[PDB]
Amino acid sequence: AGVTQTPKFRVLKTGQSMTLLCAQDMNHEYMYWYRQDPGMGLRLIHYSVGEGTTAKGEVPDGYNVSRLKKQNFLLGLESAAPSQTSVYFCASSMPGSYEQYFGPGTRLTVTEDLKNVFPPEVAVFEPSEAEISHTQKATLVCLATGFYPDHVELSWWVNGKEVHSGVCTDPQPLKEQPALNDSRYALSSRLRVSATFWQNPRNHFRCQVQFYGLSENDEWTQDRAKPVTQIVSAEAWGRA
Amino acid sequence: NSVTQMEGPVTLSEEAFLTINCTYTATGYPSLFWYVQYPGEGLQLLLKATKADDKGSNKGFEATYRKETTSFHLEKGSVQVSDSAVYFCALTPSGGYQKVTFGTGTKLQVIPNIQNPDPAVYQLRDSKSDKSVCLFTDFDSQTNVSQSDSDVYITDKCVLDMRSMDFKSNSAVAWSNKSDFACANAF
């Protein structure tokens, strides 16, 4: 840890420019920029062996880099193309433990039109009475639909506290229109608790979907609200 | 320099023995590594071996640097569901003054041992409502959840851990907008 990436998510129109920033306060001389794609593994774009120097990796075409200071390594996209839709990871190391320390990754999506960007609709489905009576357990389902790009973070909150145990979210969102190009996405999650915990009318359950959308410095000329970074939630009280 | 590791997804049941093969081709005497990538995270060093016959060990995993067979096979005696991740074999010349050569990565899926499988399909109504969803749950890990038409959506299986009761279960969700949509047929 200790390597930071800014932004964590970004949606871009084809032909538009952007800069990915990677910061580190471990006084590591070496910094790297990678991209990760299905079936292609982790591929090096560019790397730096020190302040001021940059060298080409395996896939440098379409990207530029800069190492103005030792702490920062910048990755530029001059004219974004749909082939540059990827997860980008930065890393750093100190030669002379010299393993690479990675950042959390940046999810980049290149779309033909920013009009295609949509926040999710979120709904919670209450546990089945048949499940409860047979198993003494209760599964709540959260469903997030109609969102584009697939830049979401789903989480469960029970009595105002973020829950991790008894939760499972789909590893990948599914395409609502598999045939189409700029299809919107759907993602489900489940939370399973004891039947007695669900039957308490004092217990509060909330599904939260953090959506990453347009930045403040993005042109918006459309009928609806600007699909900015927001939190879309759905909740349910425990029912006796 | 090159790193060739086991390809395609690996699926093991909980507590099974794991072996992820990794072979290299190197100029001199390189340092060898295993990186692990948990879902939705970056890579992190799992273990390493600086010299021949050295053994790296962490989180119940181990790998021996065999110079005779130019290999660094990863092994774990009893895999856990929490071990589901992408594993990367890697190498760099001694000192760390040069770039790292990574293998393609091996995706590991660890499926739970369901003690009492009881496949069941349930209908769930929206708290705010006339919307509904189907839940397929409590089936064994050898059950293949079939894919869907573009009007009926079916997720892949997902593993949930109810620690509070030392209990794990598999589930999948189905939903549709069609008026003639029954849970009894969804899965």
Residue numbers in the entry:
A (entry chain B): 2 to 97, 101 to 244
B (entry chain A): 2 to 130, 132 to 150, 152 to 190
Quoted from the paper:
As compared to other human CD1 proteins, CD1b shows particularly strong recycling through the most acidic endosomes, use of a particularly capacious cleft to capture large lipids, and it is uniquely expressed on a subset of activated macrophages in the periphery. After identifying a distinct pattern whereby T-cells respond broadly to phospholipids in preference to sphingolipids, we solve the basis of this response via a ternary crystal structure of a CD1b–phosphatidylcholine–TCR complex.
No significant movement of the CDR1α and CDR3α loops was observed between the BC8B TCR structures, revealing that the antigen interaction surface that contributes to the cationic cup is pre-formed. Whereas the BC8B TCR cationic cup is formed almost exclusively via the TCR α-chain, the PG90 TCR cationic cup was formed from interchain interactions among the CDR3α and CDR3β loops. The cationic cup observed here is pre-formed with the TCR α chain, whereas the PG90 cationic cup is formed by three variable loops in TCR α and β, and becomes a recognizable structure only after contact with CD1b-phospholipid. The BC8B TCR detectably interacted with CD1b presenting the sphingolipid antigens, SM and sulfatide, but did so with extremely low affinity, 60.4 and 83.6 μM, respectively, as compared with CD1b-phospholipids.
